[PDB]
C-alpha cells in the first residue's frame, strides 16, 4: 500500500531509476498473481475435502444400513 503509491508518484513526471521502479511494479504484480494462485488452489482443495467427507458419511450410512 505505502510501498506502491510512492512508486506511482515518482513516475508521474520526468531516469534510470524509473526502469528500477517499473521493475518493482512488475515483480509486485508477479507476487500478486502468484499469491492469488495459491488462494485459488486452497479453495479447490477445501471444496474437494468437503465433497469427499460428505461422500464418506453418505456411503458409511448406506453401509451401516446393510449391516
Amino acid at each position: 500500500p505505502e510501498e506502491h503509491e510512492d512508486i506511482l508518484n515518482k513516475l508521474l513526471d520526468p531516469q534510470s531509476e524509473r526502469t528500477e521502479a517499473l521493475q518493482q511494479l512488475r515483480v509486485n504484480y508477479g507476487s500478486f498473481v502468484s499469491e492469488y494462485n495459491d488462494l485459488e488452489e486452497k479453495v479447490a482443495h477445501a471444496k474437494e475435502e468437503n465433497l469427499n467427507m460428505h461422500q464418506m458419511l453418505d456411503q458409511t450410512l448406506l453401509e451401516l444400513n446393510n449391516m
Binding site: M56, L57, T60, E63, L64, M67
Partner: protein
C-alpha cells in the same frame, strides 16, 4: 476411514452387548422359574401342616414369605 471403521466396530459391539444381556436375562428367568416352582410346592406342603404348629415348618414359612427387609410380621 479409520474413523468410519471405528463407528462400525462400536455398532457391532453395542449389538453384541445387547445380545449378551438378553442371553443373561433369558437364562436367569428360566432359573427363577425353576426355583419358584420348588418354592410353590414347598408352600403348599407347609400350608397342609399349619395345624401342627411345627416350629421347623413355621420357620420355612417365614423364609417363604420374607422380603429383602426380612421376615414379614416378625416373631
Amino acid at each position: 476411514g479409520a474413523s468410519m471403521d471405528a463407528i462400525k466396530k462400536k455398532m457391532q459391539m453395542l449389538k453384541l452387548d445387547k445380545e449378551n444381556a438378553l442371553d443373561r436375562a433369558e437364562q436367569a428367568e428360566a432359573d427363577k422359574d425353576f426355583y419358584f416352582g420348588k418354592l410353590r410346592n414347598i408352600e403348599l406342603i407347609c400350608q397342609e401342616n399349619e395345624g401342627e404348629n411345627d416350629p421347623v415348618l413355621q420357620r420355612i414359612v417365614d423364609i417363604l414369605y420374607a422380603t429383602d427387609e426380612g421376615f414379614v410380621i416378625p416373631d
